[PDB]
């Protein structure tokens, strides 16, 4: 259920995001002490927010957008999103042959790549676990031959069962439309729709 785009619909190029804004939200409670210490306490999940803006739209591509959005509203499903700036295939191989030991938790993953993978991740790559919709971001990476380790932000939302597999490619955010409760399109006498924008918040 991808948000339609030029890669899916090169004919409808207007659907290419004019610009995108990615926000981390890390709700935290903090205070400043008179001795000049700072102290902070964390609760609740981090989440990714995304904002999208579109140019003027012609009626056809607009109708394709509405036909998507109303299908989403009727079904109550999720919106999948790709994010082109991270589309690089620097890691490849038989991902489903990798073994992740169970009981890893907290922010460090270690893997047996079994010598299978080729290439390496980079800081700022996206990373995902096969059985869970969350998107994480690589802070750091190390090798010891076939063994890899990566330190990842935010902290892991699950304990590893040992059935997980890593996913370095084709990561899609799963999101829903917090703006959607008052959605609507201006129509100008040019015959063109205007003022569309989307605010998305990941949801699990």
């Amino acid at each position: 259920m991808r948000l339609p785009d030029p890669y899916t619909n090169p004919e409808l190029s207007g659907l290419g995001f004019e610009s995108v804004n990615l926000i981390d939200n890390d709700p935290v409670i903090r205070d400043e002490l008179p001795n000049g210490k700072v102290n902070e306490v964390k609760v609740s999940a981090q989440y990714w927010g995304i904002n999208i803006s579109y140019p003027e739209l012609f009626p056809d591509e607009y109708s394709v957008l509405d036909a998507f959005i109303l299908e989403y509203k009727r079904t109550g499903g999720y919106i999948d999103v790709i994010l082109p700036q991270y589309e690089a295939f620097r890691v490849r191989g038989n991902t489903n042959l990798v073994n992740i030991p169970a009981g890893q938790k907290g922010s460090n993953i270690t893997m047996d790549t079994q010598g299978v993978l080729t290439g390496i991740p980079k800081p700022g790559d996206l990373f995902k676990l096969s059985n869970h919709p969350k998107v994480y971001k690589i802070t750091s990476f190390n090798r010891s031959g076939n063994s890899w380790s990566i330190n990842v932000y935010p902290d892991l939302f699950i304990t590893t069962t040992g059935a997980e597999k890593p996913v370095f490619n084709g990561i899609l955010f799963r999101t829903k439309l917090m703006n959607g409760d008052a959605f609507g399109s201006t129509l100008n006498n040019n015959g063109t729709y205007s003022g569309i924008s989307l605010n998305l918040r990941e949801s699990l």
Partner: protein, 106 residues
């Protein structure tokens, strides 16, 4: 005093209450989470140079925990002398026997 009957004990306790009543001051402030585990009637020594206070002695009198961890407190002043009694004197000379409802014999 509803539940006390040893005269000397009652007097020694009233002396406590009188001495305590001289120490009127109450003080309130907030503490960071590391001081967790405080309770009422814990003993605090407070030190603050601008007021000239130096191990000024207080008892904790109210506490409020919070989900974040920030602790509000209030202190009540006491002295040491609150807990010390004077001498007293034997009161045995007035053990009045309140006999009634009796008829003297011939």
């Amino acid at each position: 005093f509803a539940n006390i009957t040893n005269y000397y004990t009652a007097r020694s306790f009233a002396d406590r209450e009188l001495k305590k009543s001289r120490y009127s001051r109450t003080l309130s402030f907030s503490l960071p989470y590391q001081f967790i585990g405080i309770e009422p009637n814990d003993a605090i020594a407070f030190t603050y140079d601008r007021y000239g206070w130096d191990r000024k002695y207080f008892l904790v009198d109210e506490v409020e925990n919070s989900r974040e961890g920030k602790i509000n407190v209030t202190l009540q002043e006491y002295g040491e002398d609150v807990f010390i009694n004077s001498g007293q004197v034997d009161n045995s000379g007035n053990d009045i026997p309140d006999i009634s409802n009796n008829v003297l014999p011939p």
